[PDB]
Design an enzyme around this catalytic site. Structure first.
Site, PDB file in Angstrom:
ATOM      1  CG  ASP B  29     105.612 -38.598 -15.264  1.00 34.42           C
ATOM      2  OD1 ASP B  29     106.367 -39.401 -15.842  1.00 34.42           O
ATOM      3  OD2 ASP B  29     105.820 -38.198 -14.098  1.00 34.42           O
ATOM      4  CG  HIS B  98     107.277 -32.362  -9.880  1.00 35.41           C
ATOM      5  ND1 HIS B  98     108.531 -32.229  -9.319  1.00 35.41           N
ATOM      6  CD2 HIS B  98     107.094 -33.689 -10.080  1.00 35.41           C
ATOM      7  CE1 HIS B  98     109.079 -33.424  -9.180  1.00 35.41           C
ATOM      8  NE2 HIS B  98     108.231 -34.327  -9.638  1.00 35.41           N
TER       9      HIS B  98
END
Ligand SMILES: Nc1ccn(C[C@@H](CO)OCP(=O)(O)O)c(=O)n1
Ligand SMILES: [Cl-]
Lengths: 102, 112
Positions: B29, B98
């Site tokens: 991320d 996700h």
């Protein structure tokens, strides 16, 4: 102290029940009947079961009116703040959940 | 329709990819909320978990196993948290399914 009605769903593979210490207006728990102690100890043979638990969670979220959104949480170990060593999927909704997620 | 994840999947946007197979892709991320923060996404463009279906059962299970295997590879032995956000109240901001994996620090309660 919970009542049998706090069990929202049950089948041969899992149980769904309300959290007696809710962190949101709606807060319930999906657990497998197979005592996987934590997600890090799940194995490849558990693939279909794990998939089923997520599906059950989302079906139950719909049943509980979480259409405006919700959050699914699985805690592992001390840093995850896992409190019981049995696999739990948390489902929270009915308020604006924040970021970061803890 | 296509989110930014479409660029990560087709590799037009460089990402720190941790794992890939025909069903899913794992990458760090870029706005991390923990010392370790990566995302596990299906290659099938399910927009949100509330729109997953019965034929996605196996894929969903696979995403979880990939999440846990990658957690191990990243050294999250003292624990971690998996998060899936659905919709506005869940604070979902990218509408491609996700799973967040967060570790390397104490996660607090409530989870947001
Ligand atoms: N400081 C912030 C504020 C917001 N978001 C976006 C995040 C939560 O809204 O997206 C969650 P998803 O759609 O599940 O990735 C973020 O990454 N950092
Ligand atoms: Cl827990």
């Amino acid at each position: 102290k919970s009542l049998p009605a706090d069990i929202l769903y049950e089948d041969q593979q899992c149980l769904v029940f309300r959290d007696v210490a809710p962190q949101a207006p709606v807060h319930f728990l999906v657990i497998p009947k197979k005592p996987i102690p934590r997600i890090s100890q799940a194995e490849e043979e558990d693939q279909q079961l794990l998939g089923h638990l997520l599906l059950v969670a989302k079906q139950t979220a719909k049943a509980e009116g979480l259409g405006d959104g919700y959050r699914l949480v699985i805690n592992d170990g001390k840093l995850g703040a896992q409190s019981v060593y049995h696999l739990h999927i948390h489902v929270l909704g009915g308020r604006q959940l924040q970021w970061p997620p803890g």
